[PDB]
Design a protein around this ligand. Structure first.
Ligand SMILES: CCCCCCCCCCCCCCCCCC(=O)OC[C@H](COP(=O)([O-])OCC(O)COP(=O)([O-])OC[C@@H](COC(=O)CCCCCCCCCCCCCCCCC)OC(=O)CCCCCCCCCCCCCCCCC)OC(=O)CCCCCCCCCCCCCCCCC
Ligand SMILES: CC(C)=CCC/C(C)=C/CC/C(C)=C/CC/C(C)=C/CC/C(C)=C\CC/C(C)=C/CC/C(C)=C/CC/C(C)=C/CC/C(C)=C/CC1=C(C)C(=O)c2ccccc2C1=O
Ligand SMILES: CCCCCCCCCCCCCCCC(=O)O[C@H](COC(=O)CCCCCCC[C@@H](C)CCCCCCCCC)COP(=O)(O)O[C@H]1[C@H](O)[C@H](O)[C@H](O)[C@@H](O)[C@@H]1O
Ligand code: HEC
Ligand code: HEC
Ligand SMILES: CCCCCCCCCCCCCCCC(=O)OC[C@H](C)OC(=O)CCCCCCCC[C@@H](C)CCCCCCCC
Ligand SMILES: *C(=O)CCCCCCCCCCCCCCC
Lengths: 158, 50, 223, 54
């Protein structure tokens, strides 16, 4: 009965850096922050982009995507009402393919945040995604898609 | 087990695959592992006498 | 590519929307969301053949691939476009790279494997048992691309070794070590699997003890 | 028996503060030199850069 109602395979979160929030009619998937940090923290005043895919669960729609702002002054450049039984892809997660060189509606609703607060990858940061149907807190992480290891200074024995 | 699950529209205690394994192994046990052997059980029992 | 994305979309539509709901959002308590898993994850799961999965068990097992390379790539591209994530390595021609993923260094690959992989798989990539109905599959079958993409994306109950944990150089090294251990003949005679103590003990108690006791019966006399 | 320590659901915790290690004491006093020279002043070492701002 390892394949009973409590099976390991069915209850498996995707092996992705982003977090998934199911609260509300719209479901949030692959929620994370692209924020290349060159030091201990990401200093306030630097724009870091917020990636997520919003899926409208019901076909009857919560396409509003009102504010989705938190501490950091979230800004939705190229805002649009994308969700209609379809993905709302705010940005371009590392590895995302631009299907065509031309972009419809300019940037596909790219979300950016001015930190106003130090952040370092490996932490949980709350972002209150507000939709017309409801609002949800996500505790967004920081994700680095494919940027290889930055060369650490070689150690001098002492 | 299958019948207790089937008395209710919901899945009270059997997962879909658990119930499927249940009817599979039940049919196989009761055809190929109870009946086709017990015919030969009765054979060995009485046919040499008969 | 547009046609590639269309083909991947249609195959996804007729194969897995039942558990990775249309729009790639995972169905609750049937399958995870694929947004962000990336093209590497699809290549790995669908090429191993685990991914058109047909049960919830302790672990989804590897099985003959239900798709071929071109439409494997179609599914991977569809998932990548929807979510965006890691990409499978490829060679100059454009196909999935196999020989290029065999790192030159193998002793370094050996150390990396033993510290990281052998934990659950084996000394030499054989299997290992996990908590409850889970296990680490044998690495003899996996091809270099499959090993690389398995390290890149933790399929299930496997740590996800990002490109930063194991630099592509280190992943090529580990792939080379896995292939070398898989295809290297066992010196000293028939390798009783890769597990030493258990196969050797069983081989003793069967071969050597049956031979010895049979010779004792032949030389000796029953009475 | 169970070990005495056990769980703590209360006091969820705080994010670890950025580590700032203390200088190595007289025992491991050996450290990289900052530069040697005559230094006929309050002290400048053998390394002193400057940035030109417009
Ligand atoms: C490979 C290695 C070489 C194999 C060939 C060597 C001998 C095999 C013949 C088997 C019969 C036998 O030994 O008796 C004849 C005879 C013994 O007769 P006896 O002691 O003078 O009087 C016997 C009485 O009739 C009293 O006998 P009984 O009526 O009480 O029952 C006789 C027989 C009846 O019980 C049986 O087990 C009979 C089945 C014999 C077939 C075995 C081979 C099957 C092939 C499968 C793969 C094997 C590997 O039992 C045995 O004597 C067999 C004992 C152990 C089985 C030997 C092979 C296993 O021995 C020989 O002809 C030479 C024996 C040489 C010693 C080696 C025996 C063990 C080697 C097997 C190693 C297995 C793993 C290695 C890889
Ligand atoms: C053992 C005994 C007669 C005790 C008498 C009463 C007594 C003193 C009790 C107090 C001691 C206690 C507390 C005992 C409980 C637990 C215990 C036995 C602990 C001691 C263990 C020990 C040091 C020795 C016991 C070993 C023993 C006598 C084994 C049986 C030997 C025989 C005659 C086996 C059959 C002959 C034969 C053809 C064997 C080969 C065929 C096969 C495959 C047999 C099964 C088999 C075996 C037997 C393996 O050992 C084995 C090891 C690793 C991998 C696989 C196998 C395996 O498949
Ligand atoms: C009695 C003395 C005679 C001993 C035999 C001597 C024969 C010498 C053989 C030839 C030279 C040495 C071969 C060394 C190369 C070699 O080892 O041989 C493998 C095969 O191995 C297998 O599969 C098993 C095949 C089945 C036949 C052998 C079975 C004999 C057993 C039964 C004897 C012990 C008794 C145990 C009793 C059991 C129960 C009784 C109550 C073959 O390759 P392969 O198949 O591909 O191995 C896979 C890697 O590739 C891949 O990565 C790796 O990941 C793996 O998948 C690996 O298997
Ligand atoms: C429930 C049946 C089921 C169906 C059918 C199915 N999946 Fe999934 N999928 C799962 C489960 C369960 C997992 C995670 C555990 C596993 O993979 O065994 C998963 C995980 C994945 C992963 C890897 C996730 C990760 O983080 O590594 C990918 C990629 C994927 N699925 C894509 C697909 C594709 C492509 C198809 C169609 C070829 C498909 N799935 C069909 C259930 C399913
Ligand atoms: C227990 C922790 C764990 C460790 C650590 C681990 N693995 Fe795995 N590995 C697994 C599990 C569990 C699977 C099964 C994945 C599945 O069934 O979807 C697996 C699958 C694989 C596969 C797929 C083989 C096949 O036939 O499907 C390969 C190749 C592999 N691992 C290699 C590695 C390498 C290389 C490392 C070192 C970077 C490693 N493993 C470290 C547990 C682990
Ligand atoms: C005390 C000893 C005497 C026993 C007395 C009566 C003993 C009476 C035993 C009632 C057993 C009731 C079953 C309840 C199962 C269940 O719902 O629990 C859920 C669990 C989580 O599900 C599972 O995980 C798998 C459970 C599957 C059990 C397969 C057993 C198959 C045995 C075969 C491998 C053959 C072995 C040979 C055995 C040969 C036996 C010959 C008699
Ligand atoms: C998961 O590990 C197994 C799922 C199977 C659940 C249904 C079991 C049906 C009962 C089988 C009877 C076994 C023999 C009973 C001996 C008395």
């Amino acid at each position: 009965c390892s394949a009973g109602q409590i099976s390991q395979t069915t209850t498996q979160e995707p092996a992705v850096n982003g977090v998934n929030a199911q609260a509300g009619q719209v479901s949030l998937r692959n929620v994370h922050l692209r924020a290349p940090q060159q030091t201990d923290y990401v200093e306030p005043g630097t724009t870091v982009e917020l990636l997520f895919v919003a899926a409208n669960d019901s076909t009857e729609s919560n396409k509003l995507k009102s504010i989705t702002s938190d501490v950091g002054e979230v800004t939705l450049t190229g805002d649009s009402t994308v969700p209609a039984d379809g993905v709302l892809i705010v940005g371009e997660p590392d590895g995302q393919i631009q299907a065509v060189e031309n972009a419809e509606a300019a940037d596909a609703v790219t979300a950016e945040v001015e930190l106003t607060k130090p952040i370092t990858n490996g932490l949980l940061y709350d972002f209150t995604f507000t939709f017309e149907d409801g609002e949800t807190t996500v505790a967004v992480p920081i994700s680095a898609g494919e940027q290889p290891r930055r060369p650490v200074p070689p150690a001098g024995p002492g | 087990f299958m019948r207790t699950e089937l008395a209710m529209p919901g899945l009270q205690f059997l997962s879909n695959e658990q119930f499927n394994q249940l009817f599979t192994m039940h049919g196989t046990v009761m055809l190929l592992f109870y009946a086709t052997p017990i015919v030969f059980g009765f054979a060995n029992l009485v046919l040499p006498l008969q | 590519q547009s046609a590639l994305l269309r083909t991947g979309k249609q195959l996804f539509e007729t194969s897995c929307v039942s558990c990775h709901g249309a729009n790639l959002q995972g169905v609750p308590d049937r399958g995870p969301s694929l947004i962000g898993t990336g093209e590497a994850a699809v290549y790995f799961q669908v090429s191993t053949g685990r991914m058109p999965a047909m049960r919830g068990e302790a672990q989804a097992p590897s099985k003959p691939p239900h798709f071929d390379e071109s439409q494997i790539d179609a599914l991977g591209a569809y998932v990548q476009a929807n979510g965006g994530g890691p990409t499978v390595p490829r060679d100059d021609h454009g196909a999935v790279a196999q020989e290029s993923l065999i790192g030159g260094d193998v002793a370094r690959g050996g150390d990396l494997f033993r510290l990281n992989c052998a934990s659950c798989h084996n000394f030499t990539g054989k299997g290992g048992a996990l908590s409850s109905g889970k296990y680490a599959p044998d690495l003899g079958d996996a091809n270099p691309a499959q090993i690389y993409t398995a390290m890149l994306t933790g399929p299930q109950n496997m740590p996800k070794f990002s490109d930063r944990q194991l630099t592509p150089d280190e992943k090529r090294d580990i792939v080379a070590y896995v292939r070398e251990s898989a295809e290297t003949p066992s010196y000293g005679g028939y390798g009783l699997g890769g597990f030493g103590p258990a196969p050797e003990g069983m081989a003793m108690w069967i071969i050597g003890m049956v031979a010895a006791i049979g010779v004792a019966m032949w030389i000796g006399s029953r009475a | 028996c169970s070990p005495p320590g056990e769980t703590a659901s209360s006091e969820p915790g705080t994010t670890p503060a950025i580590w700032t290690g203390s200088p190595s004491p007289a025992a491991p006093s050996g450290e990289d030199h900052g530069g040697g020279h005559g230094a006929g002043a309050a002290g400048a070492g053998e390394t002193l850069t400057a940035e030109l701002k417009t």
